């Protein structure tokens, strides 16, 4: 067995294949319905991916585009209220006779591995392309290149290595940011207080997915 967060890792993952199948079923000129406005942003994201690089639009797009598309719904998934308001049991709903109240109705992206799962997939494919395109040049030490200028390659490679770790951490923190903010207005007020930024956070989470997509584009940009 696994944790409830790992149990929740397939709630949107199944829909991710289903949405792409729906995307496969609904993809045509002037498509109205499943491919009306979302594909326009996706094309703009593809244009943004094109804005990054033509190779970056397809170097690791399967390793990148789906996760951002999934997290776009995943950001909307986190914004859902009431999921876990009653304890699932693995004077509140589950306070009496506490069975640890493990709610599977929760955002699995809140797990840092789920953020790292998309992060490592893009980071490695960029690194593999970076190994293919630069390899040693990606971490080119350049010993005394310009009168002891070797620190450029060493620090940047460490920073670049830290960046993929940070990117997973930042997404996990952003995922944790929404989860933390979920109870922020809960004890503060009994009605309508969380609405002040929950959609904004979801938009930020949607931006975070775009930022991760941007980071995927940026990692390719760095690989380029």
């Amino acid at each position: 067995p696994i944790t409830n967060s790992f149990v929740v890792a397939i709630i949107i993952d199944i829909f991710v294949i289903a949405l792409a199948v729906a995307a496969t079923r609904n993809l045509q000129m002037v498509p109205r319905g499943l491919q009306n406005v979302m594909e326009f942003i996706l094309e703009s994201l593809y244009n943004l991916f094109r804005n990054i690089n033509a190779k970056y639009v397809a170097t690791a797009f399967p390793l990148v585009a789906t996760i951002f598309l999934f997290v776009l719904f995943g950001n909307w998934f986190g914004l859902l209220p009431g999921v876990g308001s009653i304890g699932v049991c693995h004077h509140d709903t589950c306070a009496a006779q506490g069975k640890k109240l493990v709610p599977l109705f929760r955002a699995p992206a809140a797990d840092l591995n789920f953020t790292f799962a998309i992060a490592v997939i893009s980071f490695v494919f960029i690194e593999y392309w970076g190994f293919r395109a630069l390899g040693p040049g990606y971490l080119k030490k350049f010993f005394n290149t310009n009168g002891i200028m070797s620190f450029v390659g060493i620090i940047e490679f460490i920073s670049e290595l830290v960046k993929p770790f940070a990117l997973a951490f930042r997404l996990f923190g952003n995922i944790f940011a929404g989860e933390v903010l979920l109870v922020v207005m809960a004890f503060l007020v009994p009605l309508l207080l969380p609405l002040p930024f929950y959609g904004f956070e979801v938009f930020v989470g949607f931006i975070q997915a775009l930022i991760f997509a941007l980071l995927t584009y940026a990692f390719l940009n760095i690989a380029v």
Binding site: N36, A186, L192, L193
Partner: protein, 153 residues
């Protein structure tokens, strides 16, 4: 709990309330984008239809050119008939003028010959009279002129 349920319900209600008002213009924008994509598809279809009907348009232009050719040929035939009629009329008029001039010249030549013959006849009559005047004077005597000369005094 009760507070959690109330908070979730209020958040969902606020989300829907904002979503309707935002989606009104957003549905308008989505409909505009769908209409633009459909207009691009319709322009593609119109371009294909024009490419297909280029043959029909060329046939219509060829028919118009053939009609113009027929009109030009008819105008040429009419102009040829009119010019031939004018040429024939001018030839007939000139021939009539020449024939009238010839007949008039013949009549004038006859009149001139008659007048010249009359003048020559007058001169010859005077000459013939003079040819016998001396003989008549000799026969009848020349003293009459002497008598005439005396009568002059």
């Amino acid at each position: 709990p009760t507070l959690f349920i109330a908070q979730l319900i209020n958040f969902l209600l606020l989300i829907f309330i904002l979503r309707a008002l935002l989606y009104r213009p957003v549905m308008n924008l989505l409909n505009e984008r769908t209409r633009r994509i459909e207009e691009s598809v319709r322009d593609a279809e119109k371009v294909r239809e024009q490419l297909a009907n280029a043959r029909r348009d060329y046939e219509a232009e060829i028919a118009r050119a053939r009609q113009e050719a027929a009109k030009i040929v008819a105008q040429a035939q009419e102009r040829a008939k009119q010019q031939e009629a004018e040429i024939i009329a001018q030839a007939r008029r000139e021939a009539e003028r020449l024939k009238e001039e010839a007949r008039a010249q013949a009549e004038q030549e006859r009149i001139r010959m008659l007048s010249e013959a009359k003048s020559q006849i007058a001169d010859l009559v005077t000459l013939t009279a003079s040819r016998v005047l001396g003989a008549e004077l000799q026969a009848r005597g020349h003293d009459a002129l002497i008598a005439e000369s005396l009568a002059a005094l």
